[PDB]
Write a protein that binds this ligand. Structure first.
Ligand SMILES: Nc1ncnc2c1ncn2[C@@H]1O[C@H](COP(=O)(O)OP(=O)(O)O)[C@@H](O)[C@H]1O
Ligand SMILES: [Mg+2]
Length: 383
């Protein structure tokens, strides 16, 4: 039972082995079970200024706490919040086993805690499933996720092979957005990686061989995620969105927010002269996005109801107008129409996004021109 004041741990409790002889044990900092990580000061150097700066500010729940740091002759000891497992176990675990923590909100917690570091000009520099940790259930048993191992520098490239941004091997906050983008695909894909093989993933990162198979081209849910992930893992770091940019993405929106975006967009475009820059950018994509005539791809009850009062059919703007029209007037529509559409907001928005998978992603990119406006502030980062 080793004791280095104030930290207390016992061997044979080892939670896991790290890199460069790093070992983590189950131990107790004060009255409370903690995870004690033993590192070799010749290998890893602990950053005291970064840990202190984080401790002196408001603590983010999705960033892990470093309780104490103690040194003995041979080693350097660090105490961190004892956790149940890592993100790998979460992904490998069965869907029912997640204990109420959903994958999207998990990625949100990760990205939020990552933005909290970046707000302090702290770059994690190693981000990966093992450094994303799953908390132990609290009381009632709710669990969160916490990014961990930040503020550890390898003495003489930082990070773990396969999660390292290409420019580091070829640092600012965009290194973490790259690793996050790989983690994002890892969680969604249920274990797959943007670069498939473990041995050649880092090699593929350097030459940009990334491939996303698990995201279907025809599925709205997957098209939204695809557009977000590919920007994060983009080879050119200046094209990668910030942490707060990611949190505003449609990937994190609820269904009513998705429908609310479609409504708020239609009102702005109303209100826009055709050939104008906003409407021209919106109508650029499709054509294909709207599936030629969209009136052909919607159920017959809606087709007939639309015969009353002229919709283009090759226009995304007209399609957005029709969706806003049926939502505001939903109570007025015949029970045949309301049956094939609602309930609202959920089954209603899914009616259009399922039939037009690129509609939300397409509309979102075209409408970035309004990102600065006060009405679209919920949908975009105003900077
Ligand atoms: N706070 C913690 N609570 C429980 N287990 C942990 C904690 N931190 C790390 N571990 C375990 O230690 C192992 C290695 O950790 P670490 O030394 O950070 O190397 P790695 O980069 O592989 O995570 C992981 O597989 C993980 O299961
Ligand atoms: Mg770790």
């Amino acid at each position: 039972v080793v004791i280095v004041g104030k930290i207390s741990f016992c061997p044979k409790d080892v939670l896991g082995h790290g890199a460069e002889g790093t070992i983590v044990y189950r131990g107790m900092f004060d009255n409370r079970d903690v995870a004690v990580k033993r590192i070799l000061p010749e290998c890893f150097s602990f950053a005291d200024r970064e840990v202190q700066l984080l401790r002196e500010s408001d603590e983010h729940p999705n960033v892990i706490r470093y309780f104490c740091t103690e040194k003995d002759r041979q080693f350097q000891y660090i105490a961190i919040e004892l956790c149940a497992a890592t993100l790998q176990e979460y992904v490998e675990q069965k869907d029912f086993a997640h204990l109420g923590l959903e994958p999207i909100t998990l990625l949100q917690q990760t990205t939020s805690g990552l933005a909290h570091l970046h707000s302090l000009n702290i770059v994690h520099r190693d981000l990966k499933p093992h450094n994303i940790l799953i908390s132990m259930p609290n009381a009632h048993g709710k669990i969160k996720a916490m990014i961990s191992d930040f503020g550890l520098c390898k003495k003489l490239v930082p990070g773990t092979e396969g999660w390292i941004a290409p420019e580091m091997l070829s640092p600012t906050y965009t290194v973490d957005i790259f690793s996050a983008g790989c983690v994002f695909y890892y969680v969604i894909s249920e274990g797959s990686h943007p670069f498939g093989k473990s041995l050649q993933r880092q090699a593929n990162i350097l030459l940009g061989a990334c491939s996303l198979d698990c995201l279907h081209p025809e599925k709205h849910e997957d098209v939204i995620a695809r557009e977000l992930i590919e920007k994060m893992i983009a080879m050119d770091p200046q094209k990668r969105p910030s942490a707060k940019h990611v949190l505003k993405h449609p990937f994190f929106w609820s269904l009513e927010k998705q429908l609310q975006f479609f409504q708020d967009v239609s009102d702005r475009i109303e209100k826009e002269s055709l050939d104008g820059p906003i409407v021209k950018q919106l109508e650029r994509g499709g054509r294909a996005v709207v599936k030629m005539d969209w009136r052909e791809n919607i159920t017959v009850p809606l087709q007939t109801d639309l015969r009353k009062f002229t919709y283009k059919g090759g226009s995304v703007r007209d399609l957005l107008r029709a969706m806003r029209n049926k939502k505001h007037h939903y109570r007025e529509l015949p029970a045949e129409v309301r049956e094939t559409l609602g309930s609202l907001p959920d089954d209603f928005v899914c009616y259009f996004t399922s039939r037009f998978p690129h509609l939300l992603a397409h509309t979102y990119r075209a409408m970035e021109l309004c990102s600065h406006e006060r009405l679209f502030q919920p949908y975009y980062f105003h900077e």
